[PDB]
Design a binder for this molecule. Structure first.
Ligand SMILES: NC(=[NH2+])NCCC[C@H](N)C(=O)O
Ligand SMILES: [Zn+2]
Ligand SMILES: [Zn+2]
Length: 54
């Protein structure tokens, strides 16, 4: 399923897991958001790649 946890990823907005779509900053080396933090506009100024859980 595409709506599952991404293993070994911690959201840099809330320090929790990333379930469903992972938002990986394309600029910073190691920055990721979960869908809630992404929806709140955290880190909005950088382009990210958004992809489902493998
Ligand atoms: N509590 C944290 N935000 N730790 C840093 C996580 C860095 C990066 N998002 C990763 O999953 O590897
Ligand atoms: Zn989060
Ligand atoms: Zn960034």
């Amino acid at each position: 399923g595409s709506n599952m946890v991404h293993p070994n990823v911690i959201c840099d907005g809330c320090n929790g897991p990333v379930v469903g779509t992972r938002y990986k900053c394309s600029v910073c080396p190691d920055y990721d958001l979960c869908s809630v933090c992404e929806g709140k506009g955290l880190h909005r100024g950088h382009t990210k790649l958004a992809f489902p859980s493998p």
